[PDB]
Amino acid sequence: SSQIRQNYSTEVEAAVNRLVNLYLRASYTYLSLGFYFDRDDVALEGVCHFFRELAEEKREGAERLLKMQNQRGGRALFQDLQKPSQDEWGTTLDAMKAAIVLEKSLNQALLDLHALGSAQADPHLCDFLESHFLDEEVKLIKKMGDHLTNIQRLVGSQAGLGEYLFERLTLK
Amino acid sequence: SSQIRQNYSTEVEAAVNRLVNLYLRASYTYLSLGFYFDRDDVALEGVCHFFRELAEEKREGAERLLKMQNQRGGRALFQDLQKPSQDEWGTTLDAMKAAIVLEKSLNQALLDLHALGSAQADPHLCDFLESHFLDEEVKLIKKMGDHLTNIQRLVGSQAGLGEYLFERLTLK
Amino acid sequence: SSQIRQNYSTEVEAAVNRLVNLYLRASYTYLSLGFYFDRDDVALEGVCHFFRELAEEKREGAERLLKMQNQRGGRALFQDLQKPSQDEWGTTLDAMKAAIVLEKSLNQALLDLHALGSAQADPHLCDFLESHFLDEEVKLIKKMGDHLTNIQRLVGSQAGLGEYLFERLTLK
Amino acid sequence: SSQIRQNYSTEVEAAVNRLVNLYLRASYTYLSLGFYFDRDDVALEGVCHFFRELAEEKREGAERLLKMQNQRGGRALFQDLQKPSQDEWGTTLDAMKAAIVLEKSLNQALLDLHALGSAQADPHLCDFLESHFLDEEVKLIKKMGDHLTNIQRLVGSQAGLGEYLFERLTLK
Ligand SMILES: [Cl-]
Ligand SMILES: [Cl-]
Ligand SMILES: [Cl-]
Ligand SMILES: [Cl-]
Ligand SMILES: [Cl-]
Ligand SMILES: [Cl-]
Ligand SMILES: [Cl-]
Ligand SMILES: [Cl-]
Ligand SMILES: [Cl-]
Ligand SMILES: [Cl-]
Ligand SMILES: [Cl-]
Ligand SMILES: [Cl-]
Ligand SMILES: [Pt+2]
Ligand SMILES: [Pt+2]
Ligand SMILES: [Pt+2]
Ligand SMILES: [Pt+2]
Ligand SMILES: [Pt+2]
Ligand SMILES: [Pt+2]
Ligand SMILES: [Pt+2]
Ligand SMILES: [Pt+2]
Ligand SMILES: [Pt+2]
Ligand SMILES: [Pt+2]
Ligand SMILES: [Pt+2]
Ligand SMILES: [Pt+2]
Ligand SMILES: [Pt+2]
Ligand SMILES: [Pt+2]
Ligand SMILES: [Pt+2]
Ligand SMILES: [Pt+2]
Ligand SMILES: [Pt+2]
Ligand SMILES: [Pt+2]
Ligand SMILES: [Pt+2]
Ligand SMILES: [Pt+2]
């Protein structure tokens, strides 16, 4: 219906709105992860900073999707944001595992939207995702994987010491 | 139960968590307001920028409350974020009226928490709100009031022209 | 037949030549639009400057397509350039409507060439269009849409005043 | 009796003098803690520096209280300073626990004086404490809590190694 809208399906428009919800949900999860690591009885500030930065990045991702939605003449529709899956996130290992699962879920949503765009013959959409989201997700998942490996190596024996050292020497 | 917690009631802890929810809800409302004014069929970029900046400020407010919650040995608890009250926000006048109602609701929540802190004899809480929230809200509400007055003066006659001029000469 | 040519169909080569013609035609239309707004009896210099800049951008687009045609070992073939569709372009509203129709026609030609490249399995072509044309067109069409909305809002009542203000406060 | 004194009760004046004694006692405790960690058979210089800085901060606190006492037309009265509670402070964990207990005792004295000021309707006093003492104490107690958590995590196994690493990588 927009004067500008061209080659932009209702199916893609709706999936973009869903993806915005997913990115904002992810941002909210990272906010909870960050503040958990800032608790006085957890106290791993490099971990808190890692997750707070991710909270920012996912919010930024949502805003880029909303910008794009408006550029194509789609209509942003916001839904309720579901609270994060946990109130307490365990150890740095637990938290990093939860983060990689979240990232893989966002990546899968990106890949699903890419496939939809390809089926709807919407190359602007495909370029947009390739240019601003797909590579960023692959890089982030690789970093997280690297972190998991390092954390697991450290907490095999002397879990406390290992968690401290990872925060001090990798994250901080 | 925290090793650090001192003079910090369960009632205040819970009300802080509720206030975080309110600020994040407000931020989400301002995100929707901003992107509405960025629609091709609305196209008032100074208005979009005004509301996007407010979205940032309310998120920052929530983060300051969460920082404080952890400093006092309280435990952050996140809930679902309710979607904004509207999908479409009407004219700049409608939007500014919706914003002032939202701000007044946040202000009332601040005043209610202040009164609770006073009843619980929690001066750190009272100082915190006075120092970082109460004055900021009064300033913002005054600015919004000033904007409403200017918008109403402009759209009495020639509503379209007036909306354009307010965006160009006040907001931009 | 070129020593360099690889995976570059005759169908794509020909469509590239047609697209060059379309971009040069568009540039010529924008030259006519610009000089119309520079007439002493029209005299909207911000509008003239807007369209003259677009004339440059479309010429640049044509030159990028010709560069690419030579990089792939295709052969540039020039045709006659049809004169613009009008000698006089009416108001700023009329002109902006004519511009968005032109841009949408260029966008459709880009999307058609993209689909051809996809059918001919020519990813260099698809990347080229994605990287240098598709996003630029979406951005431009969005800007034009925003302008139309602003012009329409202004000329509902007091058409003359509104046209002056849009030129002074948006375009200039 | 002072020419300047206004709305400044004898009860507050006396409690201010007691608080000065408490801050100077605290400073003296931190001096003993610092020099203990500088012993050749303890030798944790980051710990020594942490506590020596706190000794300075508490002396500064006392001096601010004495300044204020004179600004309100009260009369400073000094008492004997009791020696610190220990001659030897054990491990970094023991020492940090002793420090947080001391800080909580100072915080409680601040809160008690705040309540007295509120009962005596002395807002200059309440502002003074809020502005210069209450927030500083909450921040310090949170930091100490964070340190305790980190030290405990480190000395669960390999107590010696953990104490070294905390001094090197957090305190130094
Ligand atoms: Cl559709
Ligand atoms: Cl930090
Ligand atoms: Cl849920
Ligand atoms: Cl309680
Ligand atoms: Cl903008
Ligand atoms: Cl709702
Ligand atoms: Cl061929
Ligand atoms: Cl000029
Ligand atoms: Cl013709
Ligand atoms: Cl008295
Ligand atoms: Cl030293
Ligand atoms: Cl003694
Ligand atoms: Pt940080
Ligand atoms: Pt960082
Ligand atoms: Pt694709
Ligand atoms: Pt881009
Ligand atoms: Pt990007
Ligand atoms: Pt902006
Ligand atoms: Pt701004
Ligand atoms: Pt108060
Ligand atoms: Pt503050
Ligand atoms: Pt502040
Ligand atoms: Pt110009
Ligand atoms: Pt220009
Ligand atoms: Pt493609
Ligand atoms: Pt390129
Ligand atoms: Pt380019
Ligand atoms: Pt030192
Ligand atoms: Pt220092
Ligand atoms: Pt007070
Ligand atoms: Pt002061
Ligand atoms: Pt101060």
Give the nearest partner residue to B6 out of D104, D129, D144, using CB atoms. D104
**Experimental method for this entry?**
X-ray
List the resolution, Å: 1.6
User: Scanning the structure block, which residue is given the tokens 């590239």?
Assistant: C16
- Find the ligand nearest to A116 CA: 15
Q: List the shell of residues around ion ligand 12, using CB closer than 5 Å.
A: D 82
| Chains sharing 3 or more CB pairs under 8 A with chain A | B, C, D
Beta-carbon contacts of C95 under 8 Å, excluding residues fewer than 6 positions away, are C33, C36, C37, C47, C51, C89
- 8 A C-beta contact, residue A100 and residue A148: yes
Task: Name the helix (H) or strand (E) containing B167.
Answer: none
Whether C145 and A3 lie within 8 Å, measured CB to CB? yes
d(CA A65, CA A76): 9
Distance of CA C84 to the CA centre of its chain: 13
Beta-carbon contacts of D39 under 8 Å, excluding residues fewer than 6 positions away, are none
Count the helices and strands in chain A (H runs, E runs).
Answer: 6, 0
- 8 A C-beta contact, residue A137 and residue A152: no
Of B47, B81, B83, B89, which to mutate for an interface test with A (greatest number of A Cβ within 10 Å)? B81
Q: Find the discontinuities in chain C where C to next N exceeds 2.5 angstroms and give the residue preceding each.
A: none
Residues listed for chain D: 172
Neighbouring CB atoms inside 10 A of D86's CB total: 14
d(CA C53, CA C49): 6
Neighbouring CB atoms inside 10 A of B100's CB total: 17
d(CA B69, CA B72): 5
One-letter amino acid for residue A155 of the chain: V
Compute the nearest-CA separation of B91 from chain D (Å): 43
Residues listed for chain A: 172
Which residues on adjacent β-strands are paired with residue B81?
A: A81
Residue A40's closest chain D neighbor by CA?
Answer: D146
d(CA A72, CA B45): 17
Residue B29's closest chain A neighbor by CA?
Answer: A78
Among D112, D123, A107, CA closest to B121:
D112
Beta-carbon contacts of C119 under 8 Å, excluding residues fewer than 6 positions away, are none
Can you tell me whether residue A81 is helix, strand or coil? strand
- Cα B26-B30-B35 angle, rounded to 5 deg: 150
Alpha helix (H) residue ranges in chain B: 10-37, 45-71, 92-119, 123-129, 135-155, 159-166
- 8 A C-beta contact, residue C155 and residue C162: yes
Distance of CA C103 to the CA centre of its chain: 5
d(CA A36, CA B70): 9
Among B157, B169, B152, B168, CA closest to B43:
B168
Dihedral over Cα of D160, D161, D162, D166: its sign: positive
Q: Which domain holds residue B27?
A: 1-172
d(CA C149, CA B33): 18
Task: Name the helix (H) or strand (E) containing D15.
Answer: helix D10-37
SS3 per-residue string spanning chain A: CCCCCCCCCHHHHHHHHHHHHHHHHHHHHHHHHHHHHCCCCCCCHHHHHHHHHHHHHHHHHHHHHHHHHHHCCCCCCCCCECCCCCCCCCCHHHHHHHHHHHHHHHHHHHHHHHHHHHHCCCHHHHHHHHHHHHHHHHHHHHHHHHHHHHHHHHHCCCHHHHHHHHHHHHHC
Whether C100 and A3 lie within 8 Å, measured CB to CB? yes
- 8 A C-beta contact, residue C59 and residue C104: no
Residue A32's closest chain B neighbor by CA?
Answer: B78
d(CA C136, CA A4): 14
The pair of structure tokens assigned to D65 is: 């209280």
Whether C154 and B160 lie within 8 Å, measured CB to CB? yes
d(CA B137, CA A68): 32
- 8 A C-beta contact, residue C42 and residue C32: no
Whether B4 and D126 lie within 8 Å, measured CB to CB? no
Compute the nearest-CA separation of B90 from chain C (Å): 14
Neighbouring CB atoms inside 10 A of B146's CB total: 11
- 8 A C-beta contact, residue C55 and residue C30: yes
User: Scanning the structure block, which residue is given the tokens 């000033």?
Assistant: B146
d(CA B122, CA D132): 16
Count of the separate structural domains present in chain B = 1
Dihedral over Cα of C21, C27, C33, C38: its sign: negative
d(CA A5, CA A7): 7
Give the nearest partner residue to D146 out of A40, A163, A165, using CB atoms. A40
Give chain A's contact residues with B (Cβ, < 8 Å).
2-4, 24, 28, 31-32, 35-36, 38-41, 59, 63, 66-67, 69-70, 73, 75-84, 87
- 8 A C-beta contact, residue A58 and residue A27: yes
Residues listed for chain B: 172
- 8 A C-beta contact, residue B16 and residue B74: yes
- Find the ligand nearest to A78 CA: 6
d(CA D120, CA D49): 40
Gyration radius from chain B CA atoms: 18
Can you tell me whether residue D91 is helix, strand or coil? coil
d(CA B164, CA B166): 6
- 8 A C-beta contact, residue B123 and residue D130: yes
Compute the nearest-CA separation of D34 from chain A (Å): 24
Whether B124 and D108 lie within 8 Å, measured CB to CB? no
Measured between alpha carbons, how far apart are the two ends of chain C, in Å? 50
Q: Is C57 annotated as a binding residue?
A: yes
Whether C108 and A6 lie within 8 Å, measured CB to CB? yes
The pair of structure tokens assigned to B136 is: 């900021």
D147 vs A contacts (CB less than 8 Å) = 43
Contacts by residues D107-114 (CB-CB < 8 Å, ≥ 24 positions apart): D107/B6, D107/B7, D107/D134, D107/D137, D107/D138, D107/D141, D108/B6, D109/D18, D109/D19, D109/D22, D110/D19, D110/D134, D110/D137, D111/B6, D111/B7, D111/B121, D111/B123, D112/D15, D113/D12, D113/D15, D113/D16, D113/D19, D114/B123
One-letter amino acid for residue C16 of the chain: V
Neighbouring CB atoms inside 10 A of B123's CB total: 21
- 8 A C-beta contact, residue A110 and residue A19: yes
Compute the nearest-CA separation of A148 from chain D (Å): 20
Dihedral over Cα of C129, C135, C138, C139: its sign: negative
SS3 per-residue string spanning A30-45: HHHHHHHHCCCCCCCH
The pair of structure tokens assigned to B96 is: 């500014």
Q: Is C137 annotated as a binding residue?
A: no
d(CA A5, CA A73): 5
Neighbouring CB atoms inside 10 A of A115's CB total: 11
Among B106, B48, A27, B155, CA closest to C156:
B155
One-letter amino acid for residue C118 of the chain: S
Dihedral over Cα of D104, D109, D115, D121: its sign: negative
d(CA B96, CA B34): 12
- 8 A C-beta contact, residue B58 and residue D124: no
The pair of structure tokens assigned to D153 is: 């995590």
- 8 A C-beta contact, residue C3 and residue C73: yes
Compute the nearest-CA separation of B167 from chain C (Å): 10
User: Scanning the structure block, which residue is given the tokens 């305790």?
Assistant: D148
- 8 A C-beta contact, residue A27 and residue A98: no
- 8 A C-beta contact, residue A172 and residue A45: yes
DSSP C53: H
The pair of structure tokens assigned to C34 is: 């610009």
Which residues on adjacent β-strands are paired with residue A81?
A: B81
The pair of structure tokens assigned to D123 is: 């807002």
| Chains sharing 3 or more CB pairs under 8 A with chain C | A, B
Strand extents, DSSP E, chain A: none
Give the nearest partner residue to B40 out of A24, A73, A76, using CB atoms. A73
- C95-121 burial string, b = 16+ CB within 10 Å, else e? bbbbbbebbbebbebbbebbebbeebe
Torsion of CA A52, A57, A61, A64, to 10 degrees: 120
One-letter amino acid for residue D85 of the chain: S
d(CA A95, CA A151): 11
Residues listed for chain C: 172
Å from CA of A118 to ligand 7 middle = 24
Interhelix angle B45-71/A10-37, rounded to 10 degrees, is 30
Whether C153 and B168 lie within 8 Å, measured CB to CB? no
Distance of CA B70 to the CA centre of its chain: 22
Neighbouring CB atoms inside 10 A of A139's CB total: 10
Alpha helix (H) residue ranges in C38-158: 45-71, 92-119, 123-129, 135-155
- 8 A C-beta contact, residue A76 and residue A41: no
Can you tell me whether residue B12 is helix, strand or coil? helix
- 8 A C-beta contact, residue A4 and residue B38: no
- 8 A C-beta contact, residue C164 and residue B165: no
Cα→Cα distances C162→A89, B43, C103, D70, Å:
58, 16, 24, 67
Among D163, D122, D134, CA closest to D19:
D134
d(CA D168, CA D45): 9
| Chains sharing 3 or more CB pairs under 8 A with chain D | A, B
Among B15, B46, B130, B38, CA closest to B88:
B38
A124 vs C contacts (CB less than 8 Å) = 130, 134-135, 138
d(CA C81, CA C26): 10
**Contact exists between C and D (3 or more beta carbon pairs < 8 Å):** no
Give chain A's contact residues with D (Cβ, < 8 Å).
40-43, 45, 158, 160-161, 163-165, 168-169
Of A122, A127, A130, A134, which to mutate for an interface test with C (greatest number of C Cβ within 10 Å)? A127
d(CA D5, CA D3): 6
- 8 A C-beta contact, residue A172 and residue A46: yes
Looking up residue A53, the CATH number of its domain turns out to be 1.20.1260.10
| A81 backbone dihedrals φ, ψ, rounded to 5° | -95, 120
- Cα B148-B153-B159 angle, rounded to 5 deg: 95
Å from CA of B18 to ligand 13 middle = 24
The pair of structure tokens assigned to C131 is: 């990287």
d(CA A97, CA B69): 26
Whether A164 and D149 lie within 8 Å, measured CB to CB? no
Can you tell me whether residue A75 is helix, strand or coil? coil
Cα→Cα distances C21→C30, C80, C126, Å:
14, 8, 19
- 8 A C-beta contact, residue D146 and residue A43: yes
Among C27, C15, C91, CA closest to C58:
C27
One-letter amino acid for residue A129 of the chain: L
Neighbouring CB atoms inside 10 A of C20's CB total: 22
Measured between alpha carbons, how far apart are the two ends of chain B, in Å? 50
Residue contacts between B and D (CB atoms, under 8 Å): 45
One-letter amino acid for residue A147 of the chain: H
Q: Is C60 annotated as a binding residue?
A: yes
Residue A124's closest chain C neighbor by CA?
Answer: C134
d(CA A47, CA A91): 10
Binding residues of B: 53, 56-57, 60, 63
Compute the nearest-CA separation of C50 from chain B (Å): 18
Beta-carbon contacts of B64 under 8 Å, excluding residues fewer than 6 positions away, are B132
